[PDB]
From a paper:
[name] (GAPDH) is a highly conserved enzyme involved in the ubiquitous process of glycolysis and presents a loop (residues 208–215 of [name] GAPDH) in two alternative conformations (I and II). All the structures reported in this paper have four subunits: O, P, Q, and R. Each subunit contained two domains: the C-terminal catalytic domain and the N-terminal NAD+-binding domain. Two anion recognition sites, “Ps” and “Pi”, bind the C3 phosphate of G3P and inorganic phosphate, respectively.
The activity of EcGAPDH1 mutants was measured in the buffer with 40 mM triethanolamine, 50 mM K2HPO4 at pH 10.0, and 0.2 mM EDTA at 50 °C. The results showed that the enzymatic activity of [name] and [name]+H177A was abolished. Phosphate in the “new Pi” site is around the catalytic amino acid Cys150. Phosphate in the “new Pi” site is around the active amino acid Cys150. Secondly, the catalytic cavity increased almost 6 Å3 after the mutant cysteine to alanine, which allows the “new Pi” site to occupy the phosphate.
Residue numbers in the entry:
A (entry chain O): 0 to 333
B (entry chain P), C (entry chain Q), D (entry chain R): 1 to 333
Amino acid sequence: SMSKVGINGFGRIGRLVLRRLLEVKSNIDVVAINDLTSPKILAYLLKHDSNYGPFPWSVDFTEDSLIVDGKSIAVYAEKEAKNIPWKAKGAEIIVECTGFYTSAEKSQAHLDAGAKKVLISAPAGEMKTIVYNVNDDTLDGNDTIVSVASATTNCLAPMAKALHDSFGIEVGTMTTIHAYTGTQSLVDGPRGKDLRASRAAAENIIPHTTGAAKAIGLVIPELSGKLKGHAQRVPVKTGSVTELVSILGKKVTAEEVNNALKQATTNNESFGYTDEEIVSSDIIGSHFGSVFDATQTEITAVGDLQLVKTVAWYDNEYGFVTQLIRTLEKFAKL
Amino acid sequence: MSKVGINGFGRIGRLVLRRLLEVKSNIDVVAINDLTSPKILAYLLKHDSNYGPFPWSVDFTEDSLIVDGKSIAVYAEKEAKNIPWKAKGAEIIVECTGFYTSAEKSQAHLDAGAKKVLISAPAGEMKTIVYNVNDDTLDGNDTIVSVASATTNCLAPMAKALHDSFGIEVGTMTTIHAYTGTQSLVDGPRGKDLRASRAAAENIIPHTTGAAKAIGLVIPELSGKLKGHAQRVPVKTGSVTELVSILGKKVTAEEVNNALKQATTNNESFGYTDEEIVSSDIIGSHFGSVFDATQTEITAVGDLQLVKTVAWYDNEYGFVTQLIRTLEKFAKL
Amino acid sequence: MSKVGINGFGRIGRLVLRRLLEVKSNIDVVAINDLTSPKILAYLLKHDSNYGPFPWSVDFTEDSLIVDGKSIAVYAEKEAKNIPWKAKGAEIIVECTGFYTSAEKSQAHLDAGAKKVLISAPAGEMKTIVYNVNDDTLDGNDTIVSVASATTNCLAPMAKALHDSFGIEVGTMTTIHAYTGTQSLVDGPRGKDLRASRAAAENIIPHTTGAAKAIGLVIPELSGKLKGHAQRVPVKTGSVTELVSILGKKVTAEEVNNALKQATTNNESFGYTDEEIVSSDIIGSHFGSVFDATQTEITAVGDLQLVKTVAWYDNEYGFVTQLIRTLEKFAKL
Amino acid sequence: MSKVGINGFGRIGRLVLRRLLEVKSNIDVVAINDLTSPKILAYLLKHDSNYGPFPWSVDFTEDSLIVDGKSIAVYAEKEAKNIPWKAKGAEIIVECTGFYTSAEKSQAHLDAGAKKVLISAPAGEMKTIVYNVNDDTLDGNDTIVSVASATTNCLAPMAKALHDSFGIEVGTMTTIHAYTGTQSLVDGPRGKDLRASRAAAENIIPHTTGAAKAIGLVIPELSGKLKGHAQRVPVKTGSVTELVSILGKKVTAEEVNNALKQATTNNESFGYTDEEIVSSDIIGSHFGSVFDATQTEITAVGDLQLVKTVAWYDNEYGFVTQLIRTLEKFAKL
Ligand SMILES: NC(=O)c1ccc[n+]([C@@H]2O[C@H](COP(=O)([O-])OP(=O)(O)OC[C@H]3O[C@@H](n4cnc5c(N)ncnc54)[C@H](O)[C@@H]3O)[C@@H](O)[C@H]2O)c1
Ligand SMILES: NC(=O)c1ccc[n+]([C@@H]2O[C@H](COP(=O)([O-])OP(=O)(O)OC[C@H]3O[C@@H](n4cnc5c(N)ncnc54)[C@H](O)[C@@H]3O)[C@@H](O)[C@H]2O)c1
Ligand SMILES: NC(=O)c1ccc[n+]([C@@H]2O[C@H](COP(=O)([O-])OP(=O)(O)OC[C@H]3O[C@@H](n4cnc5c(N)ncnc54)[C@H](O)[C@@H]3O)[C@@H](O)[C@H]2O)c1
Ligand SMILES: NC(=O)c1ccc[n+]([C@@H]2O[C@H](COP(=O)([O-])OP(=O)(O)OC[C@H]3O[C@@H](n4cnc5c(N)ncnc54)[C@H](O)[C@@H]3O)[C@@H](O)[C@H]2O)c1
Ligand SMILES: [Cl-]
Ligand SMILES: [Cl-]
Ligand SMILES: [Cl-]
Ligand SMILES: [Cl-]
Ligand SMILES: [Cl-]
C-alpha cells in the first residue's frame, strides 16, 4: 500500500488536504510540500485560517521544513513540477493543488520528477475523473493520473446520479451560487482574459463560467452532453449551493423526488440530506461533498410539460476536500 | 390629483422622493408618515449608504422636513387609519411600510381621507402593475393598486418578450437577490421565517418570493405557468433574475437575444446589455430590468430545449423608477 | 450545584449555554426566557452563523428545549417580573436581553423569585467584574453584579498590567469592533443613535462605549483617567482594542511586552501572542483579551512618551468565557 | 505643459483620468501603460465597482482607448524604460503602479523621454507634496516628486492646523482603512508581509504605514514626532485617520474644533463636518481629508492632556483630487 504523499500547491485546498488527513487519522503520510514561498509563510498560513480557524495540531518550521504534530515535512519551492525532488522523501502520490497542471500532459511532470501517481484537485480534460460514491468504481490499478473534478462537480454529480437512476434526466441546466475563490480579484483590475473575474469579488454578484455540467459525462456517461450551467460568484468566503433544473423522464411529485434523494444518501459518507431550513454558513466544515436540501425542491407543471429544480449545498473548500481524500485513500490501495 | 403622502420613509420611501425630485415631477409630496422623529428622517434622507448624498438641501423642524426649500409634514402614526392625510390634502398614498399589502389593509388610508393607495410590494389579487408591460390596465376608478416586487419588475418584461415572440410553456426562476431589511443583521428571531433570522451579510439564504407565481396578475396568459425562489446574498443592492423556460418554438441564442433587443428598444423601463457587467454596475439603473445577452443559454438534446435568460435589476433605485412611472400615470387619471 | 435561568437567548444567551456544556459545568440551565417560540430558539441554537453546528443534540416541544436529552423550560414574557422562575427553581439569572441594565430593573428577577442576577452588559454603579482582574471583590452578599462589555473585558486586563508595572497617568482607547445586533442591516431608524441607523456591513461607524469611562468600577486607581470610543466595522465577530497611554515610568517596547507576558502567565482569562494574527484568528478564543506584542509602539520626544498597546478579543465567545468564569464563582458564594 | 502619460491604469490610475475630465483640465492624457489589452482597460474604465459608470464614452482599438472621442495610446511594457513616451509627447508621467517608488526607479521614465514624474505613493527622501499644506515648495527645477499616501493627505492637513495653533509635542496615529489591491482575497502568500496574506474582506488586519513616520517631508517641524499604523477593514473605499497628540497648550474640544474650522474655510483640499457621518458618506469626496468634529476627544488629568482628532478620507477618489491639484500646478512651472 502506497502510504507516502506529496502536496503541490499548499493553498486553500492543499492546506485543508493535510488538515483532513490528520483529522481522519489516515495511514497516508504527507512527507513533502511544494509551493513558491518559505516554510515560515506556509507555517503561518497553516496555523491560522480565516475560514476554519486555528490548526488543531502543533505547527512549527525550519529553513527547509514544517513540523506538524511533531512530524517533519520537507518544503520545496519549485515553480516547475519536473524539478520537485519527490524521491528525497519517497513521495509516491502527488496531490496536485496549484491550478497550473490541470492536464495529463502537464501533471505527468511529477512522474518525471520521481512520483508514481498524481491526483489532480480540479477538472483536467478527458482523463479518468472521479466523484467518490458516484464513479470511484471506475478506478483501477493502471490509473496513474486522475482528476477529482471541481467542488461544483462533486456537488452536482451525486444529485444528478440519484435523479438519473430513479427517473432519467433528458435535459438540464445548473446554476451554482458559489463562494468567491483565489481565481477572482480583490479590487477591480486585470485577471487574465475573463472580464468578469477582473471585478471586486466581495462587492459583486459575478457570473462565471464553469465546466461542471458540461463535462459531467466523465462522471456519469449517460448524461454526457445533456447538461449545461454556470456560476454566480457571490460575496461569501466559503459555502456554495447548486441548483439543477431538469426535464426528467418521468412525471413526479416533490415528495417522490425527495424520497429518492433520501434513499441515495442513506449509508453514504459522501452525500448528505437535509430538510432543515439551513443557510450557507451551516455547511462550512461539512464532511460531505454534497448535501441535498429537500426544502428547496420544486415541481413546475403545465399539462405534460414538467420542470424539476433540485438543490444541494456544498462547502467548496472542506467538503470537497473530504471527497478528494476519500478518492486519495482508494487510489493509494490500488 | 398632484398631492402625495408617503407611508414608510424607508429604503423605498426615501428613494421615491429622490426620484420625484430627480425627474422634476409636478407631483407634490406633502406628508410623510413613519415611526420616528424628523431629525432622524432627515439624517437618513441626507446620507444614503447605497446612493451617497441627497442632491437637494435637507433640514427639519419638530414636525416637518424641509427638502429643497419645500416643507413636508411628518406624522408618526403606527396605524394607517390614524394618519391625518387631509391636513395637507394628501390624495395618493405611496404605501412603502410592508404592513398594508392587501386591499383590506390599505383601505385604512382611504378611511383616513386619502383617495388612492399605490402599494410598493405584492398585495394579493388586485391590479398589479409593471410599467411598460401592463400599465394600460390602470383605470380612472382604481383606488388601490400594486407595483408588485422589484423581482416582479425584473421578470415580467423578460417573460413578456419571450411570451410574445416564442411562447412560454412552463418556466422556473431564481433570483440571486441583494439583502434587504426583512432579513437580520445577526442571527436572531424574525417572526416565523427561519431563514430570515440569519445574518444576511454572511450567508447565502434561500427565500420565497411570489414573483413567478403571481405573474398572472401582470401577464394573464402566463398564470400558473411559472414558479421560482430567491437566493439572498451579501450585496447591498443590485440583483439578478435567471429564468429557465420550455419555449413554444425551437430557437438560437442569437434569435432570443434579438427578440429581447427589439422589446428593449424605445423602452424607458426595459434595458439591454451585451457588456460583461456585474451587480454593482446596475446600482443607480433607471430601468426596472436590464436583459443580459451574455448569459443567454440554450441546452438542447434531440427535440428538447431549455432556454435560460437573465436580467439584472437595481432592486432599490431601478424598481423605484418603475414605481414613479406607475405613480405618474396613476395620478393623471 | 446551582440552577440558572437565562433571560435573552440571543447571541450572548445562546453562547452562555454552549460554554456551560463545553466545560461540563455543575450549573444546570433549567429555564430560558425570550420573546419567541421554542421552535425558533431551537433553530437558532442548532445553527450558528459564527460558531457552526451546536455540539449537542437540540430539540423542542411546545413549552421547552431538549438539549443533550435534558429539558429546559422556555418562556416568552417581555416583562421580567412575570417570568415564572420558581416553577423550575432557577435561582441565578443570566440577564442578556439588553433591557435590564440597572439595579432597579434587574430587581424584577428577584421579585419573580430568583436570588442572584449576573448582567451581561455595563449596568451603572454596581459591582462590575472582569474575571482575573477584580473577581476577589465578590462576596456572599452580592445579589446583582455586572460583567461590563466585551470591550471592558478586553481593556481592563491590559490596563491593569500597565497600571501595576508602570502606572498609567492618562489614556485614550479606540476599539475596532465587530458589528452587533444594536446596529442596522439597512439604512433605517435605530432609536436616537444616528450612526447606529447606518448599514453595518457596509460602513466604518463611530460608536460610543463606556469601557474606558467606567473603568474605575473594575480598576479603582484608574477612575476618570481613561476615555475612548469604538469604530464598528464589517466583521461579524472578532474585535481589537488599542489604548494610548502616558505611563508613569518610561519604557521600551520589549519591557512593556515582558510585563504583559508575566501578567498572562497561568492566567486562563488573559492571553498573549507574538504571532501576526488578524481578527478571524481570535474567533472561538477562550480568553477575554489577548495581548498582541506585535502592535506595541513607543513614540518618544524628549521626556514625552506615548505608549500604544493592543489586544484582541472575540467580543462574542471570548467575553462569554469570562462571563461564565464569573458566573461560576458567583454561584459558589 | 499639457501632455501626460499614466503608468498604472489601476484604481488610482483610472480615477486620475476620470478626475481630469471632471474638472475640465487642460491637461490631456495622451498615453497609458499597463500589463493588459485595451479591451480590458476599457472594460475597467467603463465599469467601476466603487464609483459607477464612466461619465463619458469609452471605446477602444487594438492599440488605444477612445475616451470622450479622443485617442489615447495603450502600451504594455513591464519595464518603464521600454515605454514609448517620446511617441505621443508624454511630458509628465503619473506613476501609479507601485513598482517605481524612488528617484532612481522613476528615473527610467526620464531615460525614455519624459521630463517630470509625479509618483502616486510615498517615494523615500524626495520632494513629497500634500496639496494645500506644502505645495508652495514646488519649483520649476523639480523633475521627480511624490504626493505620498492617501493616509498622508488625510493626516497632514489636520496635523498642520494643530501644529500651527497649538503645537504637537508628540503623537500617534491609527487609520481605520479600506482594503486595497496590496492585500489578499483569500488566505495566501503575499510576499513577506504575513498580515497581508490574509483575506482582506473577512478580517481586521493590522498593517504598517509610513504616513506618520515620514510626515517630516510635508511638515518639517513634525519630523520624528509622529508614529502610527493601520487597521485594514472590510470596506471597499473610505477610510478614517485618528490622531492622539500631546499638544503644546491646554485646550477644550470647542477650541480644537474652531481652530480646525478655520483651517478648512475656503480650503478646497480640506473639509469639515459636524454631522454624524459614516465611511460610505465620504465615498466620492472632493477633499484630501474631512475633519470630523463629532469625534474630537480631550482626556485631561491635571497638566497631562491627550487630544484625539479624527479626519475622514476617500483613499481613492479624495486622494486623487489632491493628486490632480498637485499635477495641475506641477504642469504650469
Ligand atoms: N477554492 C475552491 O473552492 C476549490 C474547490 C475545489 C477545487 N479547487 C481547485 O483546487 C486547486 C487549488 O485551488 P486553491 O483555491 O487552493 O488555489 P490557491 O491560490 O488558494 O492555492 C494555490 C497554491 O499553489 C501555489 N502555487 C501556484 N503556482 C505554483 C507552482 N507553479 N508550483 C507550486 N505551487 C504553486 C500558490 O502559492 C498557492 O499556495 C485549483 O485547481 C482549483 O481550481 C478549488
Ligand atoms: N428593499 C427592496 O429591495 C425592495 C424592492 C422593492 C419593493 N420593496 C418593498 O417596499 C416596501 C418597503 O421596503 P423597504 O426596503 O423600504 O423597507 P425598510 O425596512 O427600509 O423601510 C420600512 C419603513 O417603514 C417604517 N414603518 C414600519 N412600520 C410602520 C408603520 N406601522 N407605520 C409607518 N411606518 C412604518 C420603518 O420605520 C421604515 O422607515 C416593502 O413592502 C418591501 O417589500 C422592497
Ligand atoms: N458583542 C456582543 O454581542 C456582546 C458582548 C458583550 C456584552 N453584550 C451584551 O449582552 C446583551 C445581549 O447582546 P446580544 O448581542 O446577545 O443581543 P441579541 O439581540 O443578539 O440578544 C437579545 C435577545 O434578547 C431577546 N429580548 C429582547 N428583549 C427582551 C425582553 N424584554 N425579554 C426577553 N428577551 C428579550 C431577543 O429576542 C434576543 O434573542 C446586551 O446587553 C449586550 O450589550 C453583547
Ligand atoms: N488604493 C488606494 O487607496 C491608494 C491610495 C493612495 C495611493 N495609492 C498608491 O497608488 C499606487 C497604485 O495603487 P492602486 O491601488 O491603484 O493599485 P492597483 O493594483 O489598482 O493598480 C496597479 C496597476 O498597475 C498595473 N501594473 C503593475 N505592475 C506594472 C508594471 N510593471 N508596468 C505597468 N503597469 C503595472 C496593474 O496592472 C494595475 O492596473 C500604489 O503605489 C499605492 O501605494 C493607493
Ligand atoms: Cl513541469
Ligand atoms: Cl456549459
Ligand atoms: Cl413559486
Ligand atoms: Cl469616554
Ligand atoms: Cl511609525
